[PDB]
């Protein structure tokens, strides 16, 4: 803890070429563990631990939950387009929901939706009502509140979501609690007369990390540029920070990498 469970849903009129129009993927503590799409018509494990700690019930049920959501989302695409007076084109429904369990026993939840990449509607903090982000979502607010949708999502988020998240974290404790050391490389090709120094951490886990440039031993932040944290294909991450120097001042710069996996912070020069 903190521990998180997150589901994100995409429903699109224009995927497109050999791509599924409907997808749902689940993440525990920010890592992919579950996948469903309209081509497969099947939920599948994406980590060894989820597969090893569930029975066939789990997959057959989730699969049919996925197939059900597929029909509901087909209609919702239709409904939102009509609200927006659309008769064609690329459009998308997005759902994003889940729960957090904070180290302190306190939980959190959120249920929010977008249309064409913009806020459409969401359950509000007290989980008693929905707040439409656009006028087109107003009839939806009215309908759901008449149908006691908020209460139904209060239960899912505060009980169902949390209880299952407890099971998941327990299943994949070892995997989620592991550490993987980044290999770091510093490099500086140039031209146009500027020495561009780059420092890259490869395959670190968990996610959090610090990669900084030092100039005369002093951290040169204001002007280093980061690509942020981007994922590898194996549940590890990558980051890449650059800085331009004089061609010759190269020897004055050092990249420093701090990570939980490291015996000591890495400190590396160019060349």
């Amino acid at each position: 803890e903190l521990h998180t469970l997150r589901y994100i849903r995409t429903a699109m009129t224009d995927p497109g070429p050999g791509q599924p129009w409907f997808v749902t993927v689940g993440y525990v503590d920010g890592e992919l563990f579950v996948h469903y799409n309209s081509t497969a018509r099947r939920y599948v494990p994406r980590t060894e631990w989820i597969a090893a700690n569930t029975d066939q019930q789990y997959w057959d049920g989730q699969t049919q939950i996925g197939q059900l959501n597929e029909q509901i989302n087909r209609e919702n695409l239709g409904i939102r387009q009509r609200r927006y007076n659309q008769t064609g084109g690329s459009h998308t429904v997005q759902w994003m929901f889940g729960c957090d369990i904070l180290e302190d026993g306190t939980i959190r939840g959120y249920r929010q939706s977008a249309y064409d990449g913009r806020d459409f509607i969401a359950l509000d903090k007290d989980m008693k009502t929905f707040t439409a982000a656009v006028p087109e979502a107003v009839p939806t607010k009215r309908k759901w509140e008449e149908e006691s949708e908020p209460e139904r999502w209060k239960n899912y988020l505060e009980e169902t979501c949390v209880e299952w998240l407890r099971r998941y974290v327990e299943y994949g404790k070892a995997e989620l609690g592991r550490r993987e050391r980044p290999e770091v490389r510093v490099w500086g090709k140039e031209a146009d007369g500027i020495l561009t120094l780059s420092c890259r951490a490869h395959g670190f886990y968990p996610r959090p990390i610090v990669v900084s440039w030092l100039k005369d031993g002093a951290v040169r932040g204001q002007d280093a540029h980061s690509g942020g944290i981007v994922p590898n294909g194996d549940g590890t991450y990558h980051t890449w920070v650059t800085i331009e120097a004089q061609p010759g001042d190269g020897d004055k710069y050092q990249c420093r990498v701090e990570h939980a996996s490291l015996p000591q912070p890495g400190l590396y020069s160019w060349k």
Partner: peptide, 8 residues
């Protein structure tokens, strides 16, 4: 676990 959406 995943859960079912309501109808818009």
């Amino acid at each position: 676990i995943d859960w079912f959406d309501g109808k818009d």
